[PDB]
């Protein structure tokens, strides 16, 4: 739709890629497996990159010249989840890496001599402060900016 061309519903250049290139995968008139049970170009590796026919799903997917597909993601015509869908995903996963970073850490500096408890690991991964992340509804999006890590502690 935008700068490159249209998706899969038509993309001539893209078509030629499907075909030569891969199918020369062929290129081995035979190469012996008339019945034989190992050498697996034959089945998939192609067909798994291949039965990926005039279908790949359908994805929209813009495809420029040479027909390699380009990613716009400006939230329009079709392309929205090529950054946001896998974007918030990156955010959510990280941040629940470091929400617990700021956790199997803020749980130690106390009691009796706590000077490298960390070269061994008290609860592995934290396996206690663990889910605090999925057990983040809202969470730091409020309690970070109000109290605890409070401007005081700033």
């Amino acid at each position: 739709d935008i700068a490159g061309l249209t998706p899969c519903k038509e993309s001539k250049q893209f078509a030629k890629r499907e075909k030569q290139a891969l199918k020369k995968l062929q290129a081995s008139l035979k190469l012996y497996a008339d019945d034989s049970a190992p050498a697996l170009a034959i089945k998939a590796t192609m067909e798994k990159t291949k039965k990926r026919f005039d279908n790949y799903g359908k994805y929209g997917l813009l495809c420029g010249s040479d027909g390699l597909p380009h990613l716009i993601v400006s939230g329009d015509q079709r392309h929205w989840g090529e950054f946001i869908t896998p974007g918030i995903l990156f955010l959510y996963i990280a941040g629940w890496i470091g929400w617990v970073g700021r956790s199997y850490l803020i749980a130690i500096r106390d009691e009796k001599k706590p000077t490298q408890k960390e070269i061994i690991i008290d609860v592995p991964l934290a396996s206690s402060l663990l889910f605090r992340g999925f057990s983040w509804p809202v969470a730091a999006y409020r309690e970070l900016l109000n109290g605890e890590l409070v401007d005081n502690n700033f």
Binding site: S28, L31, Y32, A33, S36, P38, A39, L40, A41, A44, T45, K48, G98, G101, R102, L105, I106, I108, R109, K113, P114, T115, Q116, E118, I119, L149, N153, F154
Partner: protein, 730 residues
Amino acid sequence: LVDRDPIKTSFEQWAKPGHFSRTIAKGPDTTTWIWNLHADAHDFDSHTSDLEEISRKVFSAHFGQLSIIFLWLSGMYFHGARFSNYEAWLNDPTHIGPSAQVVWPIVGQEILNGDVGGGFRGIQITSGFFQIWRASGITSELQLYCTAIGALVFAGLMLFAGWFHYHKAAPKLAWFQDVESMLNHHLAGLLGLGSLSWARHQVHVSLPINQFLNAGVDPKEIPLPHEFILNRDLLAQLYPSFAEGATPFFTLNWSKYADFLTFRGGLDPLTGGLWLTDIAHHHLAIAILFLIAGHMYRIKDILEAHKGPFTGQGHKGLYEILTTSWHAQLSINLAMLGSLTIVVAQHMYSMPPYPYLATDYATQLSLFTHHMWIGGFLIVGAAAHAAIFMVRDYDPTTRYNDLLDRVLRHRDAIISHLNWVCIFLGFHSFGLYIHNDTMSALGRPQDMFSDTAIQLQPVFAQWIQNTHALAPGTTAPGATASTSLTWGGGDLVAVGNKVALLPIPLGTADFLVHHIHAFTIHVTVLILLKGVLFARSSRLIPDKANLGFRFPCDGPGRGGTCQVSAWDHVFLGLFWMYNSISVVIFHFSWKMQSDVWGTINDQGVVTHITAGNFAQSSITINGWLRDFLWAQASQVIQSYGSSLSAYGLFFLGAHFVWAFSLMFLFSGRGYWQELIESIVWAHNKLKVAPATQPRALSIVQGRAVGVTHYLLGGIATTWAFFLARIIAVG
């Protein structure tokens, strides 16, 4: 330390901060000690001030190498077995192009798996099993699958001898601190009783099971699993059951024979891997010696003997402390073990010892550069550890006034010479090339240094090469060809797929590389020599054995006072050797393909992988990227979308990793500190840092992460550059 003992815990030490020098890892937190711990983990200035144990550790923590080399090999025999290609390749050599490894088609993978021979998808090999494996006086895939577990057997057991040391209450002093016999044994019967033993399983079984393989068949249409006992009847084709002789001696009659051996030299027409009819004799003729030889002896005596005027008074007494060192009797060794590896690197390419090598090009140069980096990576070491001696090992100074106390006496001297040696070289050893450019780019060939312009005339010949391939006419008995087919005189006909070895001519463009080597080998050693020599004291610092052989640098004063030390002479000595070897490699293949490797057809009109481009064109040091680097490497930068591809696809990383070393090599230190805090600050605001005081790199650790990178970078680069210009044409 307790915890608490002595004597009066089994209760092991798991928990309580530290260990290793005594205001130790302190309660107070830090990071540096986490590269500490791994580095210098093995060392000996700490563990105890008392020899004793250490030798009781090194004879154990040794062990776990053999066992390992043993878990390794197994996954190689297994691998070289059921992940087959060996069965398929052997009925069908000259033809195949071997594999042992294969991916699994996860993610992108599979491109890496590209038809290799006896009909299957895989990644190739430049590690000549499939060719030791010619041996198998037997053949069979599941069989290698026994030699394989036979491997895991030696391991677990030759790994429970390591439990059955240090951890078990150990031997002591006398045991090694009586040395009296050690080599007696070693060389006699293993050095002997292997080579010997190897003889018995090198004509018994192997010779016959490739005496009638060098023709056709398909295995098991030959060599059963037992067949070769008392049945001395097939041994009938490959000489007598001694007929009427009885245990050599002479009252013997030959009207027509002379046992197996019947000495060869040259190369099998059909399998030019050098003859086997010999290979027994030579190993037999070894062992004997070792068998006789390992029978000296008990030790001073021999060294406590020959002195002279300027010679070595301390020659006599050349170390009580050679039963009391290690760091000494390791450093010596590495020079030999090491220097005795890259002597392999030649006798290999100019005298193959396995069936199907040379024709196999890529599966014995990989070799000649792998074996080549050890006969170098083990030598700079062979200096390091002498520096480790020269600094510390002994208790006090009980060692006195001798060969050494001598050498040191002169020291601003042995290294005073050697220096000039290098600038004489270099000027005669590199600007030599530069002439050519400056004057071939000026362009007047009349006056270059060409194999033809500066006076040398269509011949090299008359030296010693030409009195080597021609020597089977001395005290020499003989046996068609020479010793190494690459010698001047006679013969040609070598092989019927591709080629192998032939004369290999010289003059200039062989004259002067051979000389750059000199200057390269020499200034390497200058820096190690002067490095290990000035180990402990000097007139830049005399208070200079006061910590260890490392120490960053003494301090901003005296002008510089930085590099000094000898960790660092064994840091800038690596830096060269990476060249020493890296340019010796560059030499061999540009020769061995410019000439030699190439190919026969009708009228055997030879057609080298390159019609000798070398000729007038390595002499220019651009020709070294006109004819080399830019010429070959066109196969590395074309290699995408293929099967080997993993090379071109490495060749960018590792051609990156090197260009990351400079960062570690070229930089300050309180720098990444000054930086590490800006960081540490932003850290504290969110409340996320302090615990385990994050710290920059330990001046010399920084150098440790130079060098090591600069090498695994700058090296694999060619490991890729190579495997990509012998697989596929060549």
